[PDB]
Write a protein that binds this ligand. Structure first.
Ligand SMILES: CCCCCCO[C@@H]1O[C@H](CO)[C@H](O)[C@H](N)[C@H]1O[C@@H]1O[C@@H](C)[C@@H](O)[C@@H](O)[C@@H]1O
Ligand SMILES: [Hg+2]
Ligand SMILES: [Hg+2]
Ligand SMILES: [Hg+2]
Ligand SMILES: [Hg+2]
Length: 263
């Protein structure tokens, strides 16, 4: 909205692709975020000028509350550093939430287990799984109206191999000749409005399936993939944002491992 100040940085080269080893934009012109495709300095400026607030939601029920400490501590070092962050921890054990020291401009709310709340408190919602840890930068380069993350096991696979729900009886059904990517349900988000639309669409599709006595092969994730097939995300995050070094190592195609599973 407001003018960016004078900035000094390398001139982008029109005849020099940033990455030649991977696809950096989808067929519907949504960027695919890989290290080397963005200048974080320009992006931080753009979002700071808008005083952007990012909500980060995690669900820690039962034994998963044990992952909160590492999750929050690492988020403090790598997630949206410099911008306003509001952590939303949904848990069945309010008292078990660890007391983690937060940087300025960042807050955490514990919700024991309305959507209207999100609309007035944050500009974007990022929904992730709690049994993870941040190992590198995860910033505003991911912010957009709607984004999904490439599942680390299928980013190089053909659609036929994607583990979409294949039964026509399911609302999450996707035939073998359809599909752009296989997105993992452990990392998605976008504007509050778009995220609520996605979740509302998924919840309704799941109810319909339940009534028909059917459960999608990969539950929530199956419906997420159906939704993102019909409502193309405005950005797609590379596997840099959802990886497991123990199971997949550290391929050359990944210059950074930013968000990973906990052994
Ligand atoms: C970073 C995960 C590495 C790949 C492991 C296999 O992942 C599973 O893939 C299916 C779709 O084919 C679903 O996405 C499952 N939810 C994935 O399971 C993952 O691994 C298991 C062991 C659990 O940790 C689960 O929470 C993970 O998503
Ligand atoms: Hg969410
Ligand atoms: Hg979530
Ligand atoms: Hg759902
Ligand atoms: Hg969903």
């Amino acid at each position: 909205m407001v003018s960016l100040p004078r900035m000094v940085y390398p001139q982008p080269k029109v005849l020099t692709p940033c990455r030649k080893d991977v696809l950096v934009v989808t067929p519907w012109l949504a960027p695919i975020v890989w290290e080397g495709t963005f200048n974080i300095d320009i992006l931080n400026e753009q979002f700071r000028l808008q005083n952007t607030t990012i909500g980060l939601t995690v669900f820690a029920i039962k034994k998963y509350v044990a992952f909160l400490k590492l999750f929050l501590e690492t988020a403090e070092k790598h997630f949206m550093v410099g911008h306003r962050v509001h952590y939303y921890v949904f848990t069945d054990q309010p008292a078990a939430v660890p007391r983690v020291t937060l940087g300025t401009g960042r807050q955490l709310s514990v919700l024991e287990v309305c959507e209207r709340r999100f609309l007035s408190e944050v500009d974007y919602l990022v929904c992730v799984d709690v049994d993870m840890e941040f190992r590198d930068h995860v910033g505003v380069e991911i912010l957009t109206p709607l984004f999904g993350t490439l599942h680390p096991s299928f980013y190089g696979s053909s659609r036929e191999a994607f583990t979409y729900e294949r039964r026509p009886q399911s609302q999450a059904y996707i035939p073998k000749d359809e599909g752009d990517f296989y997105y993992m349900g452990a990392f998605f988000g976008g504007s509050v409005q778009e995220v609520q639309r996605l979740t509302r669409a998924c919840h309704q599709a799941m109810m319909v399936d339940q009534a028909n006595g059917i459960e999608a092969v990969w539950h929530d994730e199956s419906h997420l993939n159906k939704y993102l097939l019909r409502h193309k995300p405005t950005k797609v995050l590379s596997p840099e944002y959802l990886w497991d070094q123990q199971l997949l190592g550290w391929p050359a195609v990944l210059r950074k491992l930013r968000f990973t599973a906990v052994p």
